[PDB]
Amino acid sequence: NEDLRLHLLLNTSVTCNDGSPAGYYLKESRGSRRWLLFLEGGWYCFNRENCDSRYDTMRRLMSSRDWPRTRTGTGILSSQPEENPYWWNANMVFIPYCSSDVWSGASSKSEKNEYAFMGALIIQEVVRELLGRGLSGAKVLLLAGSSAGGTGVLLNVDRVAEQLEKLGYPAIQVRGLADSGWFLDNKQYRHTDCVDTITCAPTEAIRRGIRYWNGVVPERCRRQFQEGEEWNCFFGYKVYPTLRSPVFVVQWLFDEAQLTVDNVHLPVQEGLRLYIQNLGRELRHTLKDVPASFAPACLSHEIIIRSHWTDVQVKGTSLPRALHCWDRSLHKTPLKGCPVHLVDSCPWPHCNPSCPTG
């Protein structure tokens, strides 16, 4: 079965980068009042030349022209109980990432602009269009995402909640699940002036991108940092405290993208060993006041739509279990025997034997 079926947006003015219509893949589950809306990741591009490169060799992330009519749901998007213990019977939606703007953009293609950056508008239009396919009667809408999509969750969840409330759907509980989108703007390991700006100078690439995209960040965070400093709101530990919606944060303690931006490659000598240990400690520190989180001591990247997402455990608790326990806590404290805060204490990648094998 290829249960996720493509729907191009009916408002064809809400577009991928090249002006083709954006869209979503849907598996309806008419017996369920739960909705999972998943935001795909895949970095971003921050100026014309950088986006032209991406257009040459990552065109599916910039255009719907060659999207397949169907997809197979994997991980948290699987309808098989064995693969997805959490939400196998839910209404599932996969929103392809074709805006290259960390889901923040609000700029149309025009004679001035070769590319459209409409990620923030794509999300709201998908939500409105799903109201006609069952969403209006929902109990829960979980906005989930991996990598740039995880950061997209942080940047968009409260706007989805506000839009639904304002449209007359107050009984839909809007929640977020941010996977591999919780980054540190930390000092890099033995920084050099390398030419891949996105990994060599992330805060500068994000600042530049936001201007190029007419990028939008959540209001309360925007108001804290003010004009020119909206890039701050792309960093989980900064934006998270400003959010009203419940958000479950999944983050490997040694996320491959974090290590890339930190100039780290894995004998490892003292300086790098201390660097890596401090990285894990800093990440754990940022998660201390997040109620519900899952952060294993592994070197990996993304998890929630991977088929083996059920395998990793922190202190004997899997991610699907944690997510279930989170659901129970929102009936915002955990229930006895049902942990929601699962962060490894060990200090080196793969000190947890249940880490993904690569």
Ligand SMILES: *[C@@H]1O[C@H](CO)[C@@H](O)[C@H](O)[C@H]1NC(C)=O
């Ligand atoms: C469709 O989307 C465009 C671009 O976001 C917007 O300006 C326009 O108002 C929308 N039309 C409708 C009918 O919603």
